[PDB]
Amino acid sequence: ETVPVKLKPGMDGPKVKQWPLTEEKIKALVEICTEMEKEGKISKIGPENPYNTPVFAIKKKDSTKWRKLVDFRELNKRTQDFIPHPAGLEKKKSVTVLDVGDAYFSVPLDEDFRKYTAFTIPSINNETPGIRYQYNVLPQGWKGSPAIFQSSMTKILEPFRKQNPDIVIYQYMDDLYVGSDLEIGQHRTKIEELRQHLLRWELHPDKWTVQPIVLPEKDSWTVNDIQKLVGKLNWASQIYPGIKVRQLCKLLRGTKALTEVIPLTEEAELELAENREILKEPVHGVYYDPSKDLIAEIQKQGQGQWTYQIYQEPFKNLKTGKYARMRGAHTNDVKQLTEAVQKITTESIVIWGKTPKFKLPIQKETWETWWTEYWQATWIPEWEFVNTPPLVKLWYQLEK
Amino acid sequence: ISPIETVPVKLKPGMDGPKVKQWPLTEEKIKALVEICTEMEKEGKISKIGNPYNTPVFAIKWRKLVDFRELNKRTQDFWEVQLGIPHPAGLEKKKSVTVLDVGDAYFSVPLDEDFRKYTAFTIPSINNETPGIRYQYNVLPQGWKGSPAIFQSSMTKILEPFRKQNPDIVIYQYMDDLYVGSDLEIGQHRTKIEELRQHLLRWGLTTPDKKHQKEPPFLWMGYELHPDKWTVQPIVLPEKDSWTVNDIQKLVGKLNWASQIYPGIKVRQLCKLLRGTKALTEVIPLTEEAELELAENREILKEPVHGVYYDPSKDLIAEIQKQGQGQWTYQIYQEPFKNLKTGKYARMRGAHTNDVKQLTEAVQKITTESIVIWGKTPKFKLPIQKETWETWWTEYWQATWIPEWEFVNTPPLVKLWYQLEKEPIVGAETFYVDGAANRETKLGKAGYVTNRGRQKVVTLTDTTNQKTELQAIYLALQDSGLEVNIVTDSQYALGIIQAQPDQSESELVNQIIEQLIKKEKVYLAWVPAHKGIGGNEQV
Numbered sequence: 001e002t003v004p005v006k007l008k009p010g011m012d013g014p015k016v017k018q019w020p021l022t023e024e025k026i027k028a029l030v031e032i033c034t035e036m037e038k039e040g041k042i043s044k045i046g047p048e049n050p051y052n053t054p055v056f057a058i059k060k061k062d063s064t065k066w067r068k069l070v071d072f073r074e075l076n077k078r079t080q081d082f083i084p085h086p087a088g089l090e091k092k093k094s095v096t097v098l099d100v101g102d103a104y105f106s107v108p109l110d111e112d113f114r115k116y117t118a119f120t121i122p123s124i125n126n127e128t129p130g131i132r133y134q135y136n137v138l139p140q141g142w143k144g145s146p147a148i149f150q151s152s153m154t155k156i157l158e159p160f161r162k163q164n165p166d167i168v169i170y171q172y173m174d175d176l177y178v179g180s181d182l183e184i185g186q187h188r189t190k191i192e193e194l195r196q197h198l199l200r201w202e203l204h205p206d207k208w209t210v211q212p213i214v215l216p217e218k219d220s221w222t223v224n225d226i227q228k229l230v231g232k233l234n235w236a237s238q239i240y241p242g243i244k245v246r247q248l249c250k251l252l253r254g255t256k257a258l259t260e261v262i263p264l265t266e267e268a269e270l271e272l273a274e275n276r277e278i279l280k281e282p283v284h285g286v287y288y289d290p291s292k293d294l295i296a297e298i299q300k301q302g303q304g305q306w307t308y309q310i311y312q313e314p315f316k317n318l319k320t321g322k323y324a325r326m327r328g329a330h331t332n333d334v335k336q337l338t339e340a341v342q343k344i345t346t347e348s349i350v351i352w353g354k355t356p357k358f359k360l361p362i363q364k365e366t367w368e369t370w371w372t373e374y375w376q377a378t379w380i381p382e383w384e385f386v387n388t389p390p391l392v393k394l395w396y397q398l399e400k
Numbered sequence: 401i402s403p404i405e406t407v408p409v410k411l412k413p414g415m416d417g418p419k420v421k422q423w424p425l426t427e428e429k430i431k432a433l434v435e436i437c438t439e440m441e442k443e444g445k446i447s448k449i450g451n452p453y454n455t456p457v458f459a460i461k462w463r464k465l466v467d468f469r470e471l472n473k474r475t476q477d478f479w480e481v482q483l484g485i486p487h488p489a490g491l492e493k494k495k496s497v498t499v500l501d502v503g504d505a506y507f508s509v510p511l512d513e514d515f516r517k518y519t520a521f522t523i524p525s526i527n528n529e530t531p532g533i534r535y536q537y538n539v540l541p542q543g544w545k546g547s548p549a550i551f552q553s554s555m556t557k558i559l560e561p562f563r564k565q566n567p568d569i570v571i572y573q574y575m576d577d578l579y580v581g582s583d584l585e586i587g588q589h590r591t592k593i594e595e596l597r598q599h600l601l602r603w604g605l606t607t608p609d610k611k612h613q614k615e616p617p618f619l620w621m622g623y624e625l626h627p628d629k630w631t632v633q634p635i636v637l638p639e640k641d642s643w644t645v646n647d648i649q650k651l652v653g654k655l656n657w658a659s660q661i662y663p664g665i666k667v668r669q670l671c672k673l674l675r676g677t678k679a680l681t682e683v684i685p686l687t688e689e690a691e692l693e694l695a696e697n698r699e700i701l702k703e704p705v706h707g708v709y710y711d712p713s714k715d716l717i718a719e720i721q722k723q724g725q726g727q728w729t730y731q732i733y734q735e736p737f738k739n740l741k742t743g744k745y746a747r748m749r750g751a752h753t754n755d756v757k758q759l760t761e762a763v764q765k766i767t768t769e770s771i772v773i774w775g776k777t778p779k780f781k782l783p784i785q786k787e788t789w790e791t792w793w794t795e796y797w798q799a800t801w802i803p804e805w806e807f808v809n810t811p812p813l814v815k816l817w818y819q820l821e822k823e824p825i826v827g828a829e830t831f832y833v834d835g836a837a838n839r840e841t842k843l844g845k846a847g848y849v850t851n852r853g854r855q856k857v858v859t860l861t862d863t864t865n866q867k868t869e870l871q872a873i874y875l876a877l878q879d880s881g882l883e884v885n886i887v888t889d890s891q892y893a894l895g896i897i898q899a900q901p902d903q904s905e906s907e908l909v910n911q912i913i914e915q916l917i918k919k920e921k922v923y924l925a926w927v928p929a930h931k932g933i934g935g936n937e938q939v
């Protein structure tokens with residue numbers, strides 16, 4: 001029994017190249033892949049199958065074993081289309097994610113669609129022709145899986161849902177998001193309860209928003225101080241038209257030494273005051289648009305600090321934030337960035353139920369050869385690489 | 401009829417079989433083909449038939465040739481045969497290594513009967529009229545899109561067994577070859593080869609007898625391979641009295657290739673000879689330098705470059721050198737002075753970068769390489785102080801990284817040619833710079849005004865929007881003490897400079913960089929253009 005899944009009109013199968021992998025990772029994929037083949041989850045394939053999808057191995061949150069991960073991004077895009085977001089999920093005192101990837105294997109994949117799910121296991125130095133396989137069951141990571149399995153998913157969920165209502169359950173791809181206001185102990189104990197249920201077959205959203213910008217405060221100001229202050233505000237006026245630098249810029253006339261101290265006019269004084277007040281809140285009229293793509297930009301602040309914004313339109317932020325590197329990532333820019341992107345995406349899902357498109361301050365090559373080494377999530381957002389404009393940085397560096 | 405199952409082949413969706421016309425051929429070319437097609441028929445490779453589709457047959461004793469170019473254009477895509485093949489440096493030492501030319505094996509594999517119809521071709525006639533001799537292929541056609549692919553795979557499955565039965569035996573299939581190696585004793589080995597051979601044969605696969613099989617060392621993308629080590633095939637540099645462009649280009653190509661293995665190779669002067677060349681056949685006299693350069697190269701190329709295979713039980717170490725700005729060299733070894741590999745990276749030339757950055761890139765290329773050669777990352781021995789690294793990285797605007805590495809003091813070291821001040825400098829003159837130029841004319845001026853009253857301005861002809869500003873800045877630098885402050889409304893400075901480049905495409909920039917490097921302390925500050933902002937309102 002299977003539903004006849006198809007590709008979007010006129011779309012052809014993915015033919016993406018496999019990137020090189022650490023010997024270690026390769027050894028695992030093979031171990032893993034033989035297991036699945038035994039259990040009939042996959043089958044080696046003929047050369048008459050030209051498609052391909054990248055695959056790799058990870059060791060997510062706390063484990064001595066490797067997990068197979070497949071990048072179906074392309075496939076996903078070409079897959080035809082087919083539950084809405086629980087506007088309250090965002091409003092719960094605590095959320096917990098769940099990996100229900102396994103549930104999928106319990107289902108046959110349409111016969112004529114499998115070819116497109118083809119993947120390749122490499123061999124160091126091309127000393128061996130790669131190991132070609134294609135799925136027989138719904139694979140983890142493909143957008144089709146959560147769907148075709150929606151039916152049996154809800155079915156097994158009702159009894160727990162209906163049993164609590166003060167708890168929310170949201171499913172994104174391989175993942176499951178659940179939130180409750182119950183205290184920590186109860187929350188967790190209740191989670192396990194859910195796991196148990198499923199077995200039969202740490203977010204706190206209340207801190208996320210657009211963030212507060214604070215301007216410097218000083219005993220005495222220098223020309224420089226003021227020039228910098230002014231460049232910032234001026235820019236900021238693309239977000240707040242009420243922000244004004246008239247008075248301040250007047251103090252800047254003549255050609256004084258960058259280090260000379262300037263006394264502030266009462267006007268300038270009020271101006272500063274007036275701007276501080278305008279900035280006390282996020283710009284008005286910012287509403288998420290479901291029809292548009294969600295954008296998530298990131299800046300390197302340094303010293304392990306990282307700012308980010310999530311918007312759909314320029315200078316209209318749905319949310320902004322800082323992220324400070326985790327323990328033991330010190331010498332690793334890539335790890336931190338990777339860490340943050342995952343965090344920002346989870347938080348994006350939690351809120352609007354989808355992943356944003358990232359703009360990364362890192363070279364494509366650097367990112368490509370190492371991101372997989374620290375990835376842990378079942379999903380994989382979209383991304384492009386960019387050059388950070390100096391001011392965007394200085395500005396967001398000012399958040400409280 | 402034959403052992404192996406066929407693979408299911410399809411024509412691209414919508415397309416259909418070839419329809420080409422058979423050229424007219426001489427009476428002696430026809431006879432030759434008639435005879436070949438009879439044998440082939442016998443041997444069972446082709447079947448007599450006489451089918452809408454047709455492909456042109458040729459004649460080059462005579463040897464036949466069929467043109468599938470059309471068929472191919474109509475043949476489904478396959479899973480491509482990797483063009484990325486083993487690099488000596490990533491191979492293992494074997495007590496022995498054989499090679500089995502399975503040349504005739506191509507035609508030893510059944511073609512999806514369902515698809516044979518398409519291969520239909522026709523032997524012409526002297527009689528423009530008479531019914532041509534019609535045939536089609538039963539096996540993989542020499543020169544057909546699918547051939548390469550299929551065959552390997554087939555081969556692959558046939559070895560599946562034997563490999564499984566012999567975990568201590570490495571087999572490598574390339575083209576119509578099989579590099580079978582191992583660490584067993586010569587008889588043990590010999591015996592196994594012979595075992596392999598009969599197994600292949602059990603599948604209708606033919607190999608040459610022991611009194612035919614090729615010999616070591618082996619030729620591999622530039623090297624001679626012994627089972628215990630490799631040596632570079634010595635490269636021959638012509639010696640002519642007349643050098644054409646073509647000549648110099650080939651040469652250069654060759655020389656460049658050498659740079660990797662051999663150290664000290666240069667082509668700057670040889671490369672010069674190609675300036676303004678009007679034709680490939682054009683003869684260019686070698687200058688003195690070019691005559692010299694070329695000489696030292698012949699000397700270097702004599703030297704035998706011997707190498708060592710990959711010992712999976714030892715550290716993989718890469719050490720790097722800056723052979724010049726943007727020029728880097730590296731060698732990868734496991735034992736001091738016994739490299740499995742070396743190479744150099746061409747002077748990548750950007751729009752604006754710095755050495756530390758460039759170093760980082762080299763490191764990443766190297767890394768990606770090894771991940772392939774060895775599926776592992778090397779421990780880096782780098783000509784840069786950890787202090788330097790930590791200073792630059794911790795604050796660079798762009799996410800960067802270098803895997804495990806250690807400092808190695810081998811001049812010239814890679815450093816920060818200069819560091820813009822974190823704060824304005826007290827007592828240091830403050831230049832308020834600005835440049836303006838007629839967008840369209842390429843006429844402009846650039847100058848500054850300091851707090852100390854010093855002023856200047858220059859008119860510039862044939863200049864752009866950006867160039868003036870930068871020049872403004874340039875001037876300020878020239879005309880200031882070892883310490884200066886410079887304020888500018890240039891967006892271009894804010895980045896390009898504040899991102900502290902020590903090399904660029906823009907010559908101007910280059911100059912500013914030279915200047916910057918010279919000072920003792922420089923603080924740059926940016927301010928919004930076209931504002932009541934003083935200084936900026938002077939400009």
Ligand SMILES: CC[C@H]1C(=O)Nc2ccc(F)cc2N1C(=O)OC(C)C
Nearest residue numbers: 491492572579580581618625626627
């Ligand atoms: C089969 C053994 C395998 C290997 O590990 N080391 C060597 C060493 C020397 C050789 F001449 C060949 C090879 N081998 C190989 O596959 O090389 C192909 C590129 C020709």
